[PDB]
Design a protein around this ligand. Structure first.
Ligand SMILES: COc1c(C)c2c(c(O)c1C/C=C(\C)CCC(=O)O)C(=O)OC2
Ligand SMILES: COc1c(C)c2c(c(O)c1C/C=C(\C)CCC(=O)O)C(=O)OC2
Ligand SMILES: COc1c(C)c2c(c(O)c1C/C=C(\C)CCC(=O)O)C(=O)OC2
Ligand SMILES: COc1c(C)c2c(c(O)c1C/C=C(\C)CCC(=O)O)C(=O)OC2
Ligand SMILES: O=c1[nH]cnc2c1ncn2[C@@H]1O[C@H](COP(=O)(O)O)[C@@H](O)[C@H]1O
Ligand SMILES: O=c1[nH]cnc2c1ncn2[C@@H]1O[C@H](COP(=O)(O)O)[C@@H](O)[C@H]1O
Ligand SMILES: O=c1[nH]cnc2c1ncn2[C@@H]1O[C@H](COP(=O)(O)O)[C@@H](O)[C@H]1O
Ligand SMILES: O=c1[nH]cnc2c1ncn2[C@@H]1O[C@H](COP(=O)(O)O)[C@@H](O)[C@H]1O
Lengths: 395, 395, 395, 395
């Protein structure tokens, strides 16, 4: 028998009974999210490996809510976080993105004093109705990243003093005793500063950080545009499967998940959210913008900015597959210093003032096509099997 | 045991018993259409992902009937519809294609008056024995596209007055309350003008439009040659699976299906029909022809015409993967204006007078190779499992 | 439980018991031929899609017999047939290949008189111990191709008179009433001239031609190096699956199978034979050689010969993916004339006197690596599951 | 029901119970090694086809032991063996690699006297705490390769006299009666010189060599960077599946396995070991280094060294896919001489003194990410299912 359709009728059916006959089918058209994200059946999937199937439209795209949670206590009007990278997020980006309803995560490749001064400028900043404002203060929300070394405790204290709302524990692999203990330390020292723990790609890693007290999870290992060629990497996970697996588990505890790495367009954003992510983090997509740090320069007629991985030799010196313009494939500088990312340049993207509304509109249109009015409904329909998917072959 | 063959004989079998032994096999060679088009087993398929297996020939290719239904009331001698695009279909293309036994769908990127004047020229037009003539009038058949906004009701009235036979409701996603209500409006206002509803890629979407009163379904979402790179798209479906899934359902109600987008050669046409489509719609294949609108121009020694998506910035301004000659990858012009297609150019293809007979002959030869004499038999054999298929890997 | 291995031992096993423990495994390492060639499990496979796993060597490569049957009555020392193509086989190639133990199939893109004169030169021809000699006459074996039109009956009579040993019924799809009736005609007129029928890619097609009285089967549809891009083709089959499926059935009746098309190297030959083919047919591999017809010419410093498909506009005028040097992508010349292949050029390959011994030696070495001493043993081990295979992914 | 997750809870779960809920899951996230390396389910896999999933970190990377066994009696601090190739290993490389904790295998493309003189220089050689020293002598360990022809018996005697610790039986296919008998000959003549037998890619081949008395297995057939394009090869196996299949069996007898061929970066090393290999062999990665044999020369501005396969026409004359700088695709020189590899050049890599510590550090970091402290634990976790994997699609 046909497992995808009921037996064919003997004679033509009445078109007015089409909706009744649709209910006789053994399963929905395409795949459920649970069927798509099966490691044994389909392997590890990236965003480009599948599509979301269209649903029913009964609302304009302007009615779509993109409201989501970055952490268990932080609600954002736009599910966009800028990456804590020295060529992506400083105070200018953190302010601009917050004004558009997103959230900036200021990098830590500077002294704790310089970082605290950047956090302070975001918090003190004074047309933008979607603005990410802290409810009782009306100040813009501010995030920042730190490592999990003993000296990071003192760094966080200066950041807390500067008015920090949320902290990102910056790591290629957050499932360590060092990060687990550091989370517990923040939960006891600063209970009001939300903790985004990671990076994680497995359910087992997520469970450790959820139990430690993480308020949000940063998902991704090897997915970044400036990440060393994956043919050179041994440990990681394809981003789609990573986003699904972690959020499938984390959502049971109400812990929002941030899809970090490999977001190159609106489609990637829609797909990451459709997989269970509550928000996305962008490095590459926000690099080369006016609000990003670093100077513009010309490279063979093109106006560019440097965009680099934080594990690149250049970023580590205290001063790679999918990528825009150019890049250099470095591997080592010191035998002890193993490069984990690349340094290159990205073309001028203009201001985020024009770019972020484009991403916002495009995402409302994508959710409308899927028949979805909110991120909450997107997730609910993904878990129920109402929201359908289809794998795409090479061609 | 071997599920594909019976046990091997102890000694050689007699070649005169080959046909008797063939009936001992547990299944036919290759795959049935139902086995090929399994989302869980094979993922989403495009035309290039499979082949049709050859059958038995007992007729010349000239005996193959390519007669099919564009809608439940319109019978065409050639299953070819030209796309409603400003660089594909105006009156010249609608007349020429109709004379060859096909059907032209005039675009709506003009005033309702200009569009009605184009429809009128097709209807008034007065060597071509395959000609798509309306039975009781002997005039050439004419199709036209419209949107589903309130002002489109008035547009259709001017088109109806001009002698319009069939209307295409022009949309990237036709499963909306706006289109469903617009179909019901046409069925009550103009019961004699056939409605082609869409675009649709799922069985669930098809059911809504069939129940509303659609006379034909336009299938495709993201398959078009001028469609924005699918790595940028979030919602859609691979064309083969879309064509199969929709026609598997629609054929139960006698609603013909039009395979729209990604037809680049005869093989694509044969495969779309073999999947269950009653006809194909061509944009790219018919662009650059003498009968298509727009002027010829030279681009670095090559005689070309512009070919563009209707969702391109250039088409929207009221004046991308698989593609001929050149293209530009636009994404936005206005933050509110999100590009859904690209504008490029296509090489001179000559007249359709030489081109359409080539497509017709080639398609008769393809059906002959499969052992098929008509579109009706092609479908019957596809559903029975007599017509076989084979998936093709990357190599 | 693990379906590929028995439970792991509690403590280390004795290395002297390795052969005893090997027999405790639930299945052989890798895949059986029946497991590899499963359409539902693996799709349609080409030669590049898999490898043959190595076996046990207990003989030198020089002990490998490459003796096989081209037809049920013709035994060849070398399983190589040259293709009946106007740029591959005339009398010079037919003589040279026969002297090396193979078999030439003279083309029919000439008058029946010219073709009969070429057959006669092979038969009259008078260092080469592997020579394909007819047993009771000591003359070189000669093959020739014909179509299945009424005028081909008279062509075959002139060829029979010239001393023809074997006839190839030349067709892109041999499963027709025209070929079936033509086979019966030859079996009754010339019972002593072996018939190679085809081309075929399915078990169902093979059964028809076996029942008609074919002495050998020519396998391939769309596999040829000069064959129109498969993205343009609708009907055919990946060569590996075609070779397997047809020979799995044909071998039950003792009908040898010729793997025709897509042989570009020794590995392809070994794989075609390992799949069940009794011999291979080469067009591309034998084009550009001294013995092939047509003049050498220079093309931008390179010494070349034309190599073209018999369905190309140039071959049809009575005078495309995998290919050497250059090619032109023609599609039509006359609306009635649909191109089925391409015309291009191939680099000078030298004489077959140096080339054929290279292919012979290489093939002995391949069979030795698989632990196989003869074509008969290769087939026996392929059917028993002793000969193992492995699918290869893209990387 | 969902086979990958338990039913979803009715209301939110407590994050402090995350570790308890994790134990309710029907299976671990991702795949077990046994699930990944299933030929019927996933086909033949190379290193690039999968990733290792991250585990739990509770130690610094500097605490990772890379100590492993090259043979049943030889313990190495670094699991690196240099390939016995005339452009990779002579005395300089054997000494340098041994000093870094690895093991050099001196080539045999020289007289037995010259080879014995190279072995002697390694053994007589007199800052390096990881040094591969023979326990009772304090001399550096030395390996060497030989063939299995009668004259190789006399070659080994001169090598034994020179102080040889381990012998590699050099072959593209070691499962022969010639190698099996040669192993037994060494076991009886020189019981104290460890035998590395191969090359092997199947469990059936491994069983023969284990039963003969091999102390280690050299795994690989067609995986080498200088190996003739695999589209030309008929017999072999994808490296990942080869490494897994052989080590799954060999580990039951305590016979270490050497992953030989296709190691181009640290990730490949980590993956080969994670699959069950006890060590890796490098040709390409160690060619172009100061310690490798052959002179540096300039090729269009680049400082290079020749790197060639031992089956290349140039290496055989007693004087190809994945590859650095350049290469030539030779196939034959003499009709009897069939090329099995290519000759090309590789860019200057500098000294191994800087390169080997880079590889060592990188590998400690990879094992740390997987939550693994030693090679022994890596294997134990791979067999238990604690160490997880994920397949990677093309994108
Ligand atoms: C910390 O920044 C990252 C992140 C977030 C990720 C990756 C990565 O390589 C680096 C650079 C790694 C550096 C700076 C070394 C320190 C470390 O390893 O923590 C990645 O692979 O997944 C996510
Ligand atoms: C309407 O024209 C199409 C069609 C038929 C399709 C697609 C598409 O993008 C456009 C352009 C979209 C435009 C003009 C915006 C309006 C809208 O969205 O209806 C496609 O993806 O599937 C089919
Ligand atoms: C006859 O020569 C071939 C053969 C053997 C094959 C193919 C093919 O296209 C042609 C050219 C087709 C021509 C000359 C037209 C006549 C016909 O169709 O018989 C192929 O696809 O599979 C095998
Ligand atoms: C012996 O060196 C190798 C090895 C180790 C391998 C291959 C190979 O081709 C050669 C060259 C083959 C030559 C010198 C001919 C002799 C022979 O065949 O033994 C390979 O494919 O897997 C591993
Ligand atoms: O050097 C690096 N190597 C690997 N990943 C990095 C590195 N630097 C930053 N990342 C990660 O990649 C992300 C950015 O990815 P992108 O948006 O694809 O450009 C960051 O948020 C980090 O998770
Ligand atoms: O701008 C666009 N974006 C995506 N699809 C479009 C656009 N314009 C037209 N289409 C669709 O693509 C089809 C043409 O596809 P083509 O024959 O592959 O060139 C049309 O019939 C429409 O369905
Ligand atoms: O024009 C053509 N189109 C498709 N196949 C052809 C044509 N001409 C010859 N062939 C076939 O392809 C074979 C040669 O393939 P080759 O060895 O790959 O070059 C012939 O033996 C025929 O089966
Ligand atoms: O000529 C050859 N053909 C195929 N493989 C070879 C040849 N020469 C050496 N090899 C093998 O390939 C290995 C080197 O692989 P590499 O590290 O990928 O460059 C050697 O250790 C051998 O197993």
């Amino acid at each position: 028998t046909n497992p995808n359709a009921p037996p064919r009728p003997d004679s033509l059916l009445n078109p007015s009974d089409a909706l009744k006959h649709l209910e006789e089918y053994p399963r929905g058209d395409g795949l459920s999210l649970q069927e798509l994200m099966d490691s044994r059946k389909n392997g590890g999937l990236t965003y480009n490996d599948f599509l979301v199937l269209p649903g029913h439209i009964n609302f304009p795209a302007s009615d779509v809510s993109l409201q989501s949670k970055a952490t268990k206590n932080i609600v954002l009007n736009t599910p966009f976080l800028s990456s804590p990278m020295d060529t992506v997020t400083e105070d200018r980006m953190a302010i601009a993105l917050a004004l558009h309803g997103g959230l900036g995560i200021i990098h830590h490749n500077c002294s704790a004093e310089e970082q605290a001064a950047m956090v302070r400028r975001v918090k003190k900043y004074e047309n933008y109705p979607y603005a990410s404002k802290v409810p009782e203060s009306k100040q813009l929300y501010c995030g920042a990243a730190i490592g999990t070394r003993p000296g990071d405790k003192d760094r966080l204290k200066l950041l807390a003093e500067a008015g920090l709302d949320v902290v990102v524990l910056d790591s290629s692999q957050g499932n360590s005793v060092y990060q687990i203990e550091f989370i517990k330390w923040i939960k006891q020292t600063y209970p009001k500063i939300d903790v985004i723990a990671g990076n994680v790609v497995t359910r087992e890693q997520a469970a450790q950080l959820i139990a430690a007290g993480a308020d949000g999870l940063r998902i991704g290992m090897g997915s970044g545009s400036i990440c060393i060629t994956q043919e050179v990497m041994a440990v990681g996970r394809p981003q789609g499967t990573a986003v699904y697996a972690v959020a499938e588990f984390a959502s049971r505890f109400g812990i929002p998940c941030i899809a970090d790495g490999g977001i190159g367009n609106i489609g990637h954003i829609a797909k990451a959210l459709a997989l269970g992510a509550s928000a996305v983090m962008m490095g590459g997509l926000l690099a080369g913008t006016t609000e990003s740090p670093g100077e513009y320069f010309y490279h063979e007629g093109k106006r560019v900015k440097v965009y680099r991985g934080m594990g690149s030799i250049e970023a580590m010196e205290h001063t790679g597959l999918d990528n825009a313009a150019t890049a250099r494939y470095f591997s080592e500088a010191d035998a002890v210093k193993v490069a984990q990312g690349v340094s290159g340049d990205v073309a001028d993207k203009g201001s985020i003032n024009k770019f972020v509304p484009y991403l916002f509109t495009g995402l409302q249109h994508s959710l409308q096509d899927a028949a979805i009015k909110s991120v909450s409904e997107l997730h609910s329909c993904a878990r129920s099997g109402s929201l359908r998917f289809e794998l795409r072959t090479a061609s």
